[PDB]
Structure formats: structure tokens, C-alpha cells
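Sample 1 of the test manifest.
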Amino acid sequence: KYNAPNTTPSSIGPQIRLDYYYKKALVDAAKEMYFGQLAEVTNMPKNM
Amino acid sequence: TTPSSIGPQIRLDYYYKKALVDAAKEMYFGQLAEVTNMPKNM
């Protein structure tokens, strides 16, 4: 019997791998940018 | 402006060359005028 391993041990013995690691992870999408692309740059030089 | 380690700093600002200028007010009454010519010597 399989039972509930590591809490109620299986009949044969301990099983190493128990939880399936699904590789593809979940990442939150980047928030849309609105104010950034509304102006230009003036490029203050060095020294000053 | 606050005393730097080396000493006083002469330049503290960058003088941007381009200058802001207001656009001319859009003239409206000028274009509805019919023109008659004063012929001079007159």
C-alpha cells in the first residue's frame, strides 16, 4: 500500500521523490509605463 | 555650493543655449480686410 508517505510510511519503504516540480514558473507582468515616454532629455554635461 | 574638499567651484550651473519663446497669437481679423491703394503724390 502507498498510504501517506513520511507520515504513514509506505509498505515497501521510504520514497525519495514525492512532489512534482513543474519547471515553468509564474512571473507577474511588468506594469505599463505611461509618463516615461512623454518628454525628451537635455543632457547636462560633465564638469558643471 | 557647500564647501567641497578641493575648494570653491566656479561653475555651478549649465547654461542651456535654447531659449523658450512664446508663439505669436493667431491673428484673425487681418485676413477679412479688402485693401484699396492710395496712389501717392496725394
